[PDB]
């Protein structure tokens, strides 16, 4: 398993 | 009376009484000239 | 003079609330619609109180 780097940005990536 | 709010109508009556008393005061207390 | 028809008239205002029958073809038509006006109407109807 490798790391998919990402960023917090609505509505792409949100904490449920 | 709808075009003007109830606050405008109340303040017109207050202004009418205020102007009348002030106009009478500045006209009668002057002893140089003293109908108003 | 300001005191001097369509689908938009309802979608466009918010003073008149408009509803449908529950568990009916009309509700289901609005829920699964993809037309802009009908999607706007459904989003309003689902979250109306």
């Amino acid at each position: 398993t490798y790391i998919v780097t990402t960023i917090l940005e609505d509505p792409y990536v949100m904490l449920k | 009376l709808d075009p003007l709010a109830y606050e405008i109508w109340m303040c017109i009556v207050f202004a009418y009484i205020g102007v009348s008393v002030v106009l009478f005061l500045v006209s009668r207390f002057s002893p140089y000239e003293w109908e108003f | 003079t300001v005191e001097r028809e369509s689908a938009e008239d309802l979608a466009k205002q918010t003073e008149i609330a408009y509803g449908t029958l529950e568990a009916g073809s009309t509700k289901e038509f609005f829920r699964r619609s993809k037309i802009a006006v009908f999607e706007k109407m459904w989003t309003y109807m689902k979250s109306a109180e």
Partner: protein, 41 residues
């Protein structure tokens, strides 16, 4: 675009995955689900 380090082995599979997702209407559905469904005196 989905990025990868230059010289990565995931470069080609990721490109083809995105093409498959686009041609299958998945990206349109995801976009529609995450954007549109938010909505005198």
């Amino acid at each position: 675009g989905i990025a990868t380090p230059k010289g990565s082995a995931l470069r080609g599979p990721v490109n083809l995955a995105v093409l498959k997702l686009s041609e299958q209407g998945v990206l349109d559905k995801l976009k529609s689900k995450w954007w549109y469904d938010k909505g005198s005196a």
